[PDB]
Amino acid sequence: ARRRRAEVRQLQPDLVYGDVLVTAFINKIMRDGKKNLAARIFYDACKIIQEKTGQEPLKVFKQAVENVKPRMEVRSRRVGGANYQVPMEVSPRRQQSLALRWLVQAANQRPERRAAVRIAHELMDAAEGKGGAVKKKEDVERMAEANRAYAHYRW
């Protein structure tokens, strides 16, 4: 977007919990445009969150998403002819996007048989501070702040 500022799309609220973050996670799970299958996967995963954890799955989901959000990342920049890894903060929308994308990607990396079990286990582990998505967050916050010397290339 060069001319305008590219305003953000407003998502419809969730049909169960009434949260737009849940709908965004549904969309990140969605594949080939199958909304019903993605919602089936996510709601069965919510059914798995209970009877495994006494807490309501909405709280677990939100706390896991909060645990996956990275505070700083690192972008490449061409300076003086070379390419440097410059660390800089992250806007909240990009925090949410990276959190949900990493949740889905790390969920599909699990050895669990069907999807709902994968999403449920990944959400639980990310809520209690482990899993592949938290590993991704830690790796990003390592790369960034591992190149602190380039912080004056913030831009």
Partner 1 sequence: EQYYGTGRRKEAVARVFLRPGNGKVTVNGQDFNEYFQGLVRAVAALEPLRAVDALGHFDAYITVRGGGKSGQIDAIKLGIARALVQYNPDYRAKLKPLGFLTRDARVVERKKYGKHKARRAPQYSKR
Partner RNA sequence: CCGGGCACUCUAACGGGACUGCCCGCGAAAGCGGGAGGAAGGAGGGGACGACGUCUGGUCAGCAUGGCCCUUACGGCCUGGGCGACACACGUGCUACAAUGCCCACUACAAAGCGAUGCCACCCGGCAACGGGGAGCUAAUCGCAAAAAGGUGGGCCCAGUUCGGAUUGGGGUCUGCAACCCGACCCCAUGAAGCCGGAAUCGCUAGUAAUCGCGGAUCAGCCAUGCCGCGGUGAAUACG
Interface stretch with RNA, choices 47-55, 57-65, 89-97, 126-134 (CB under 7 A): 89-97
Q: 53 or 105: whose CB is closer to Mg ion?
A: 105
Partner whose binding site includes residue 115, from partner 1, RNA, Mg ion, none (CB under 5 to 8 Å by kind): RNA
Among 53, 85, 97, 105, binds Mg ion (CB under 5 A): 105
15 contributes a contact to partner 1 by CB under 8 A: yes
53: its two tokens:
């954890």
20 contributes a contact to partner 1 by CB under 8 A: no
Window 33 to 92, contacts with partner 1 (CB under 8 A): 35-36, 39-40, 43
Label the pairing between strands 82-89 and 72-79.
antiparallel
Window 45 to 84, contacts with RNA (CB under 7 A): none
Residues that bind Mg ion (CB under 5 A): 105
